[PDB]
Symmetry: C5
Subunit: 400 residues, 5 copies
């Protein structure tokens, strides 16, 4: 239309995009800043980078871009592209992107009275410290710092508007708690100039269903299965094989899990503590199984049971465990032969009884060690998990 063509011709006359559009040069220009969170794409634990989808919101009043609607009927708003009008240089201070300005520069919508709007979308990759002390029950507070790169408070004073979460898309791995923010003023040393900024901090809570189903349950199941060695009779030769195979499975699960948590060194993760406890328990179980095996295959002709060990185990433990311990010249010549055979059989029988007593001693230490290790593992696996804060809330939310 000729009206809007004339308006466009008149507006850009003697216009400098390098000039702050204010009526009085000694007064600042008010700029309103806000956010519109859309999607939390990736929370990188290893490299400490949070990737989000954000719609920036800026608004300010211009002095030169005004006109009378009556003179130009039918046209109410005009649009200007990049590099033709002045716009604030608001930048994310703590960015972690190769292109520091990750905003797709769109048009600028203008009032009939100078008010401007600017909503550049973009995917931001900030840098926030991530704590995994209570992983996978952690709650993080990542920050987004925004401010003018070169303008001062006496020239450009930012104002904060409450963040928008209306169009937020829920994420299946992180539960958003809230995104508060507040305006802050930072004075300098030389000069009384304030330097306003708007900082938005994101609070999100990890959803624990996936890890609780794929790591805690299977690992505790293998740990429980490792206790069966104490219920296996020593006559079969599968005790050490079974124990070492559970150890191998635990090592494989360690290999599977090693790639998730980062390489931090500020605090030992809860998953690391629990896995160390489990592997130590399994190793101790293997040691006990070896001791029991060396008790069972004890040589009957070796040293006899010491009185202290006998009275300690076979009496006291049996009392506590409620188990019962099992239990003519030719005529002379043949007489000596049968006597020798009978005495040989008698010696064999007494040696067999001597071996049986050691077998019973091994069988009675086995159940004691079973009870001890069962109590140890249940207590450890309860305490380690219940130590972490907000565990009850996490299991109330992600399981019910």
């Amino acid at each position: 239309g000729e009206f809007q063509r004339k308006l466009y011709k008149e507006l850009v006359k003697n216009y400098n995009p390098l000039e702050r559009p204010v009526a009085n040069d000694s007064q600042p220009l008010t700029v309103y800043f806000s956010l519109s969170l859309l999607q939390i794409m990736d929370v990188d634990e290893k490299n400490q980078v949070l990737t989000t989808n954000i719609w920036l919101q800026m608004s300010w009043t211009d002095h030169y871009l005004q006109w009378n609607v009556s003179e130009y009927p039918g046209v109410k708003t005009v649009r200007f592209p990049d590099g033709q009008i002045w716009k604030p240089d608001i930048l994310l201070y703590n960015s972690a992107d190769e292109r520091f300005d990750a905003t797709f520069h769109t048009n600028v919508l203008v009032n009939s009275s100078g008010h401007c709007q600017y909503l550049p979308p973009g995917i931001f990759k900030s840098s926030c410290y991530i704590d995994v002390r209570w992983f996978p029950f952690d709650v993080q507070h990542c920050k987004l710092k925004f401010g003018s790169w070169s303008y001062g408070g006496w020239s450009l004073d930012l104002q904060m508007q409450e963040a928008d979460i209306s169009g937020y898309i829920p994420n299946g791995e992180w539960d958003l708690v809230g995104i508060p923010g507040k305006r802050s003023e930072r004075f300098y040393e030389c000069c009384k100039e304030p330097y306003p900024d708007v900082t938005f901090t994101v609070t999100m809570r990890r959803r624990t269903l996936y890890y609780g189903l794929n790591l805690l349950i299977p690992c505790v199941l293998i740990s429980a299965l490792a206790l069966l060695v104490f219920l296996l009779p020593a006559d079969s030769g599968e005790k050490i094989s079974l124990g070492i195979t559970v150890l191998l499975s635990l090592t494989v699960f360690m290999l599977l899990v090693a790639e998730i948590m980062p390489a931090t060194s500020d605090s030992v993760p809860l998953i690391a503590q629990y896995f160390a406890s489990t592997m130590i328990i399994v190793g101790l179980s293997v040691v006990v199984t070896v001791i029991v095996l060396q008790y069972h295959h004890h040589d009957p002709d070796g040293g006899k049971m010491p009185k202290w060990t006998r009275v300690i185990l076979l009496n006291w433990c049996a009392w506590f465990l409620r188990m019962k311990r099992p239990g003519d010249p030719d005529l002379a010549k043949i007489l000596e032969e049968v006597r020798y055979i009978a005495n040989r059989f008698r010696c064999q029988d007494e040696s067999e009884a001597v071996c049986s007593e050691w077998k019973f001693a091994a069988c009675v230490v086995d159940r004691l060690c079973l009870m001890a290790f069962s109590v140890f593992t249940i207590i450890c696996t309860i305490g380690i998990l219940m130590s972490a804060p907000n565990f009850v809330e996490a299991v109330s939310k992600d399981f019910a």
Copy 2:
């Protein structure tokens, strides 16, 4: 040619690319929007990104770019590059690309009467929520939202044309069902201005042959092989070794499969349910094998069989399982010697029979547990799979 040179010189005179080309400034400009789906490249389950090959289609009528063919014989169409004529700022709202405008800006083809065409190709990376509750039998509905970034309904009203799938290239992993779309109007709070848009939703069905051949069949084969422990005689010492080796193979297959599904926590995947069932069954089988082994190697001098257990197993189970349970002074001196030897042999024989009865008890509990576990595994592996909807359609399409 001099004719087209003159036409080009005349057309761009007093032309502003920042002006909406309409005859009346108070009336909107009609713009037709459409799509031409070409290829579904990648469906990223973990990061929830769908990558497609798309040819956008836009068309509108211009008012200033008209001429008489008689005045310029031989020339019917003209082409303009980027930044020389006004074009709509149609953008994908829900994009997930670093460059928000992933369209390769091509030329604009012009009528002899102002009609314009614009087909910018590009590879789009949208963000759509992906459900894996019925994985790998899922059907997803990803959306593509298109609309003007700054223009209003009173100025630019979009119109929807049916999508084109003529040049669609079939994908070996996803089966396209259809790509419908409809125009929608969104009114604002202040003002009665409609804000039209065109949303295209893609419906695709996963092809299940690959997963059904590489995951379900091998895993169920190992699960079936794990049942052989109940057919292995207890005299050989390979029962625990075999069971724990099947457990190790299952753990390795878990490690192989862990990397496919995402880390969501909204619903337990069907593959997760089935794998948990299989591993629980294998663990219970190992427990039963340990119990059977401790029954087989029971000490003959220990506690006798309780009457309740004897009558429950050896009579009732044998009835049900249809198996039969197996079954001169020197003269005095030598007489006592041979009597002692004979009595020793008699005691050994009765102890052997006592042990044989326990061996039979173990052999008869073994088959009962075999039957129970076989029924359990077949019922579980049938119910878990048949629970998912459209399973019959999936196996009718991807297997016949």
Copy 3:
């Protein structure tokens, strides 16, 4: 030089880069298209993308860029950069790159009579469907489609020149067969305008030495080693352990191989068929070994051999397998004692013979199952491989 400076000043006067340089506006402009294949970089099986190194070749006659050599002695050719002269907008239709125009825009070399040459190099990432039905013996036909994005046949008619392979660099993984191409005309619905294009299809054959050395040979070696269980005496307790360990090795090799082939679901790959056959054979071998073991440790006091089974195995199989089956009052008191001892020994001997006959039955079923499984595995591993076409040519080329 002043001559070339004057020529450059004169040439660009009143020149519009948006005008088709033709003498008559109603006639088309002939443009010759060709290719110069240089290197096949990557053939992506999973995402179906072929990456090549290409030198495009374009040539056309210009009408405004002509001069007399006598007027400008010493200068024969001139060069123009991007955006200063008109060049055809030839684009790869089926591209799979974020930047749809993957050509590095170089200069344009000009005749003294208007003829132009343009050779923009670039690395192209097209999208071609890849078949892995006969993997790793496949032969693929990937296509490259080239044509003007907006110009018509009445204005710009493409002409095809034979492709150049003089500077082709041989690839160690793919053997190039040839790169033919032909010109095609596509008429529209409204109008009799042809729309010419040039399509180049690449035919390449996979080199099979690497896969044939790293997958087929080792896997068949483990499959052959799995047959040794039938030559192992049952007295040793390593049969089940050996079989399950070969199964574990096969599972590990499956894990190694799983990452190569794509996730397609249109056809079962030959490698998948062969691996399924091998794993099924190994599982059946384990089942047979369990059956043999349960035959060997059969209780001598259990049910006797059925007559049918005895005559079927011990007679017929031995006939076929050519193996031979192995084979004073005190005086009265001592008389009864020695009689009892002798009768006990006699019963023990007959029970031992009864057990020996079952041991022989197991030993004779073992060799029969060995022969059956050996024939099965050799026949399967020959037929599966020889089923694929061009197998003889592949082994003649990549092995001799």
Copy 4:
């Protein structure tokens, strides 16, 4: 404001951005250079690239960009974008980025008297040689070299300002020691022109908690568990199985650890030395276990114990190890029969004693080898770790 508009109009008149702004052409221009370290993002060991977050600081005095504040009240500073004023071409010499200039060009802030400030942020990817001789106890010195690309000392002399670490964000994997720097002058061959530069070297110390918890502790635990073979009685058949299973676990841990350290060949890493020692110890333990087993199952009818071996082991080792070694015609016919039986039993008994002596010899070599291997492993695992410098400081910092 009209004042700042007039000032902007006056400043850029007859201004050439290609001219060095100095009053006297024969004198150099002083430029101050500094740094503001913000974050150490990634220390790439394999490809030797250090990625940091840096805010460059430059300052210099301009001669043409001056004005009187009284003539232009209310305006004190002006800002200029890229390409409108002259700025130094300071570049990182030893960069490892595809875009050699990884700085986001921001505005330039100007005094009222010509002084300029320029703080372009960016993420830098330098290339510094990384030493892993003492990994994971290493301390690296990566360098950042900055200097003008084309200007000389007689025209542009750099000056160094101390680095800023006020806004440094601590990293969980690297502990920053300090970032010193100094100015250096490099004369040329032809000409007495100095060429100043500023080099900043970063000193950082690796935090060892993660590796010390996930690699050293578990590996030494498996190494200790491998010693249990010497406490396992030889009667059970799990010695070789246990040893080879610990070997398999060690191989799996090698596979897990192989991907961390780079592929350098200048020095053997400490972790490589320690792992080689551990695997050699385990292999030697397996060899000793095989020797002990072949001693235990020695045939009683074979060669007798040599006198030298007997006196060396059974006497001296028992002295040192303090273990005790265990310990009528018919009448004639029956007489000969019982005599034959008794002599058979006597020969069996003496053969059993002969075998028992070899069993004791194996049992006594077992404990000697246990002691030797325990001393070897503890000494090796102490010396290898304590060899590295700053080990005490590392364990004092990262563990207390």
Copy 5:
């Protein structure tokens, strides 16, 4: 300064950046080309791409950019940015980068007499065929081809200057041998125009310490450990378990090593040959162990030793191996009873001797196979390694 401002104003008057700056249009322009190698970043074996850090060096004499120093005191050199003066279009012909021009365009330094210098840095990704026939002892010759894209020899004749390696940074994985180069002329078919170019070929030698420490030593150690099966007594039941466990470890090491070498099919790598030899040796050892086991557990009631086998083994091998092979009516009734018992014992004793002879035969074949396999493995592992050329030089450089 006003002098340099005036000089800049005068220089760019009537200057065309599209004109070759020569005094005579019919004469060529001499351009000197050189290189400054800085760092070899990555040598990609799989995709055949060599990434380097390069400083290009170009120099030529300009005719229009000259001035008198007396007229402009104090200014000796001027700098021009991209796109304001003519510069040669030297491009790397065999590039493998998406951006074909990987040079960061810097300024151009100018004499007071027209001489120009241009040093654009950049990271280049060329494409050179990589041979791995002798991996990891290979020496590669990658090439870098440079030449003008459109200018001819009659207009632009390149001249080669020797490469610079003063600032070369040593690489821990590749040892640079040298970077020679030579100028070459390529005539065309139509015309006698030479087309000069400068080609630089890089010769580098791989450092073998890392591979020689992590692959050859551990693999040969496992291969040596696999030979212990022949020193293990057959009475213990760990022979097959040990052999199959070494096989499993070898398979795991194959999985670890599979990802290093590329997927070429032109030649079998030395590492592939050696690994195939090792796995074949281990498989043959397992086969021999099975044969020995089936000899040891031979049934005493089966077929007797054939005379040929007896004389071949028990005599000849024992000769060669120097081992010795081990070694009143009631009165009648009791007489018959004791006679029967004695005859039973005699038959048992002779059967035991018959079994002992087979046990000795197995024990004597075991050591023969041990010697054979030891000789085989040492000879193979020496010959395969020593076959490769420059092996002695590699072990002299990377080990001493």
